[PDB]
Swiss-Prot record, chains A, B, C, D:
Protein name, entry field: Potassium/sodium hyperpolarization-activated cyclic nucleotide-gated channel 1
Intramembrane segments: 241-262
Motif (Selectivity filter): 254-258
Subunit structure as annotated in this protein's UniProt entry: Homotetramer. Heterotetramer with HCN2. The potassium channel is composed of a homo- or heterotetrameric complex of pore-forming subunits. Interacts with KCNE2. Interacts with the SH3 domain of CSK.
Family assignment from sequence similarity: Belongs to the potassium channel HCN family.
Gene behind this protein: HCN1
Tissues in which the protein is found: Detected in brain, in particular in amygdala and hippocampus, while expression in caudate nucleus, corpus callosum, substantia nigra, subthalamic nucleus and thalamus is very low or not detectable. Detected at very low levels in muscle and pancreas.
Length: 482, 482, 482, 482
């Protein structure tokens, strides 16, 4: 399985990939480009790359949690298990760094050129930090020293703590992957952002906790510091760590100090720093929360806003209370607490989708009418698109006796009433339709129609009907029969 | 009253129901579907169901407050009154669980199918938790033991505390009911959300308070914990509870610690947990508050935003100060601090409503004119819709001498002035109208008209007039008389 | 000056009044309505009423600050100066209450009817609270007692503290006045709201401070409370008050406790209450601040948002970097970091204003052209409105050699260049104009035109020109000369 | 280099300047205006002025940090190094003040008039404060005294502290420069605002820290204050300062008190003040953070909001799940998680840019077609603009057998399929085009076309084609060949 590896290195055909590039042909074309250099180049959007980054993340998170703690609360830093772990981690990071040269960079089209583009762009931006993070600097220093001891040890811990610069790399990895996920799974951005922030906060809190003890460790546990003053120098490491974290955490969430307000200058300064870091983090969190909340009820909010405009309009015109109430009722019936521009949405969609939607809505309404049963399907489709949805309140005249009816109505739904002088009253319900006589007559409507309950009609204007006919002359002729 | 129960189980005809489904016929149809299975199925939107859920809520809230407190601050948990209360509660929850099988689930149309749909969908989602919550697990355990004592008792309390999982159920109930209420009463979403959050916070605070003491109780009141260190082990239960709540509450609202910063590890950890929980809750609350504030002054805000755009436009064109001032004045008069797209709003409404609105606005204006007194009502209605509202600043020429008047004006309101060379000056007020001579003439206007004070006209363009006439030829002919 | 008072009682002719009602005639009409009842009715929007409310506010604020403090930190509550002050205040509030019956209520049109409308609507809503607040209840109680002493005194303080219910009245007064001010002075809503909140917070803080000491006072200064534990029972009143306020204030802003965490139950409960009140207030403040911030940079924000959409569009089309840069540059030149729909704004304005704006913009541009010097002013005006503003980037062909020019260009501004094969190159600057030959020719354009620097043209389409001509045939004829 | 200075004083030709004024000619004109007065007037937007303000900022920031500290933590305020520094600073501020008279003020066009406009407008607004800040008042007072000592010294410090009023000036300088930068570099407003606030907070914190110690210093270190109670009167200055800052900083970020809750009244009051200042600042910061967060993910948010409307629409129409899924898929393919009104954006742009964009998009698509190879470039350009982008889901009929094709399709991209009864199946890919036969025929389409995979077409309607032809009759004729 030597070619398999190569294949993996190329960008695979996934849901994401298609969205990014297009069709499978496009993907293939991209792959061809990649295939110019053999075993030296890795495509950023590839599956192998993804796997590698996942691995890194798994390692990286652990390492970030571990490293500082290891440095602080374990005195014997030269013990076997620790050292082996460190070495392996370093190796992994070196490998990652190496990969980064071979990996392509997203911009615009992705640059797959190795010797000039990948090497120079990486070396001019992020390389140095990565290099620092990956390598075991402290160990190197120790080796150099080998080829005052307490002082050296103290120095070394600080050097080791340069391995926290992997965090930048981690962040970078996260960002790209999040972007990819957005393209793929349609994740809620707000949710993602807040989650990221939470993680960051946790990490920062941990670091602060470590640091608070770390400085004392560095300074040899002086008599006027928080570790010596609480009398927990020789206590179990875990307990100490917990205490430190608590101290840090309070500063993060604005609760208070540890045992006592700082005495030594250094300690005080550290506390202040933590507070600053804590405070800003909390602010950011609050902001994120606010954003999330706004996102969550957004549609609803929009509806309310829209309604407020109507209210304002009413106020401007100084309408009677009854009128206002009626309008409110209409709005409730008409839109059902929702906000959407129907027409705009339809425009945004393609034709087939639109047609499908219309069929779902109105095919049952128009098919029940005997005029459209014998007609051709295309004609029906054409008609249906034209139809315009309407609502009427109870005790409202839809059509009137003697007034010229510009449009005909199909009752999808609702309790209507046919007001006629000659024929008494024939109440109409869902499925019925009217204004049919006044289509090709081009005159005044005979009888009246009043809404008994709330109604949901589909209006069809005479002009629109004429337009529709314009395409189907045979159909028009047929209609003209009776 | 055996059939009455069945009826109740079906979905009733309410305001909500109509909105959900449609007309009474639709509701009846839905009921028919429900009526396929007798005494085994409950419709989610039914009145009986609503009542049941209300009952549950009444029970549930009480139980959530009570349970933890009971577990903690009362040592004798095997006493009669407590046990009876518990048993009844358990029974009620079991009944609720049973109902949940028989109750239909909202999706899309509601699934009323029992054997497959209701049983499998519920069992695959929420069942297990509900089952756990409902049953008295601790009591069962005790019974088993019956058919080291201190240890057993300690264990049992934890088991009992599994009955807090009713909270999920409660939440679910609340959400659905809130949704229903939205459909029904048009509640302010923001307000609802914040209220929910407040309740949650309170509950959480209470739980934290219980927990802080609870852990000490579990651990047998060790010498280095907050209960033993304050010397309030044998104090009255109520006082202790209050203290615990205070401790919890401080962490929630970021105030501080209890008597002293934690000493024992467990206590410290608990405190940290509380802080986390507290802090997040506070953040959420803040966010909600922000959202609410934004909602409350939204219309006003929108107006301001709109105005800012006008200002920006002015800036871009670098207008003189006087001009800007004039524009500002016009805006104030024109819109009166409000924001609304009139045309859009009108489009959103149905025809009858629109007509009514127009009548309310302009029937008094047009009726006072003697041209529209003898005319037909339909014609008048047609005319009125066409009319377009306008405002003019004082010292502004509305119509001019010698310039062709494209439109005529009805003064609804304001202090106008007729500038004529021959006839001196005849100042016009609310109710007057002009540009009437230049309607069918198709030429140049004779005299000028200047605004004395601010005005509110209803313009009527000649083209629009012609269009209107197009429908009523007789009317046009009549007009042509004089 | 008996009639003067009556006049004052009626609604005056102010800026506000006109905006509310309309013209002076409208105001007069309103006044007539008021004048139905003599010396018994007060119009809500009147000047006298405003004055009265200002007076009340002046009194009310003072009283709210004073009362609680007086109750708490002065033992001798039966001393002369205090009592006189109280009595006067009570009298004033009674007077205010009386006025409230006679004052009209805003709804819709304002209800000026006394016997039924004003009396019943007020008595069914706010009366009782107002009555309670106004009257000296404590004094009445004392009188009753006159016609254990320590106990009575304790009771009386609580009764007296019912006079804080004036706060509701104050709030009501503020709201109405704020609304009026909005109509009048165009105040920033956000700013207003935050200011209100600040005031409320301050008042609440003060009350909390009073309360914290007040409860101890009521309870006779027990040995385990914050006043007795700090050993400041017999200290100077002012100091005590300050301390109390500090204690309250910390809870409001989430800082901490007083000297020590509460010991007695009552104290603890009070603290908790304060924290709740404090915390909510702080949240509200934060929200308000956020809102204010959003308001302040709103225009700018909108522009950025708009730009982001353009960027997104570019991304979707996957444009080259150069192209993107060009677009960015164009946007910067075109809109200058601002957001406004020109056309929409113009539509919103009246005609005269629009004309004025156009003159300010383009009269200097078109007048310099010799074609429009001899023409009539009306024609010029007509032309100018039609003109459409445009921008061109340097190294861009505006007009081309051999391509049919649909529109002509007036260079308001910018460094243009005339590219001709025959006539070499004649560089054009601000004031010049071109495409003039291809107006009535209806053919292909001869020479090319390229932008040297950035340009700001006013395009005029041939169709639009034709339309303009349609009104002025003589003008057209004249133009046709040469 | 005497004229060089003059030149510098005039407004230079920068990117900013052009944007502000226009072309170089405009800038020159502006310069001419400036050149009316020689060596007495400075233009606000000039380079020299900018440099001066930068210098001031550099000085000013330092001075603000230094002054208070100097006043507080150094007893010997009459020492040489300090005094020299002070004197120089004072001189600089005096110079700045002088410049301010000579500098022009931005409004509208900038006022370059010296004797009336610059002198009176400055003297009526900001002068006095500036004068106070600039001059060494304390030193003057001392001199006066020269021409109880402890008391005098105490008084003098307060007087000296009047030199903090330079902050207003600094603020003013910052605002203007920020505005200029916005015009120039297109900075993110939100980011700027937050940065400003941070700086302010830091400064305020520092001042608070100084103040907390300062009051004690003024009051002669009484026995019941925080400096005397901690026993750090004779400690090193730096340590004291740090402690003070910590105390201040806690109040700012809501953490807690210093060593102990205040005892003396003055101290308590100071603490309260700090808390107020701190609390408000924190609120503001939170608000700013929220704003920033909203800005950052704005585009994404907008997309989500838009999508929610579609969902709402679907809900309203009660569509089947499959349909909804299809719609979602279409949206994902169609818009790719982005929001933009294409048409609106195009309208906003100029013609050349639009043309360029179209070429980038569709020239490759239309050029591959042999119909447009021999045609003229102008015609091609015209055609391309008309084209309308479309998407189709797999298993969707684009064109049908027997149905009249109103528009023709160019496959930019995607896996299509040609459904024919006679000719079997010929699958089409990127670059192909169809509906070409039904262009000038004006009849029914022969064969069907179904989407195999997702597609991205460019539709071209027959009406649009006809319109395009209308300009190029020769082209039309050519097309009519075959």
């Amino acid at each position: 399985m030597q070619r398999q590896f190569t294949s993996m290195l190329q960008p695979g055909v996934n849901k994401f990939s298609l969205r990014m590039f297009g069709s499978q042909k496009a993907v293939e074309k991209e792959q061809e480009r990649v295939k110019t250099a053999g075993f030296w180049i890795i495509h950023p959007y590839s599956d192998f790359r993804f796997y590698w980054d996942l691995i890194m993340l798994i390692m990286m998170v652990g390492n970030l949690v571990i490293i500082p703690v290891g440095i602080t609360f374990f005195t014997e830093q030269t013990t076997t298990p620790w050292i082996i772990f460190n070495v392996a981690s370093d190796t992994v990071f070196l490998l990652d760094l190496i990969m980064n040269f071979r990996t392509g960079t997203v911009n615009s089209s992705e640059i797959i050129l190795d010797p000039k583009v990948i090497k120079m762009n990486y070396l001019k931006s992020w390389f140095v930090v990565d290099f620092i993070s990956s390598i075991p600097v402290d160990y190197i220093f120790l080796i150099v020293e080998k080829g005052r001891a307490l002082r050296i040890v103290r120095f070394t811990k600080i050097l080791s703590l340069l391995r926290l610069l992997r965090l930048s790399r981690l962040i970078r990895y996260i960002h790209q992957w999040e972007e990819i996920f957005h393209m793929t799974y349609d994740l809620a951005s707000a949710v993602v952002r807040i989650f990221n922030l939470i993680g960051m906060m946790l990490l920062l809190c941990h670091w602060d906790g470590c640091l608070q003890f770390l400085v004392p460790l560095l300074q040899d546990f002086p008599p006027d510091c928080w570790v010596s003053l609480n009398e927990m120098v020789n206590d179990s490491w875990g307990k100490q760590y917990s205490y430190a974290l608590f101290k840090a955490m309070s500063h993060m969430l604005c609760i208070g100090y540890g045992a006592q307000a700082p005495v030594s200058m250094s300690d005080l300064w550290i506390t202040m720093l933590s507070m600053i870091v804590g405070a800003t983090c909390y602010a950011m969190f609050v902001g994120h929360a606010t954003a999330l909340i706004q996102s969550l009820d957004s549609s609803r909010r929009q509806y309310q806003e829209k309604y407020k405009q109507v209210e304002q309009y009413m106020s401007f015109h100084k309408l009677p209370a009854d009128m206002r109430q009626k309008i409110h009722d209409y709005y409730e019936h008409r839109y059902q607490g929702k906000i959407f521009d129907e027409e705009n949405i339809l425009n945004e969609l393609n034709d087939p989708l639109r047609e499908e939607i219309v069929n779902f809505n109105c095919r049952k309404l128009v098919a029940t009418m005997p005029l459209f049963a014998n007609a051709d399907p295309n004609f029906v489709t054409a008609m249906l698109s034209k139809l315009r949805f309407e609502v009427f309140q109870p005790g409202d005249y839809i059509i009137r006796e003697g007034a010229v009816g510009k449009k005909m109505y199909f009752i999808q739904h609702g309790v209507a009433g046919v007001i006629t002088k000659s024929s008494k009253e024939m109440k109409l319900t869902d499925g019925s339709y009217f204004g049919e006589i006044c289509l090709l007559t081009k005159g005044r409507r005979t009888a009246s129609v009043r809404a008994d309950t709330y109604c949901r009609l589909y209006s069809l204007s005479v002009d629109n009907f004429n337009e529709v006919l314009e395409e189907y002359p045979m159909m028009r002729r047929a209609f003209e029969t009776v």
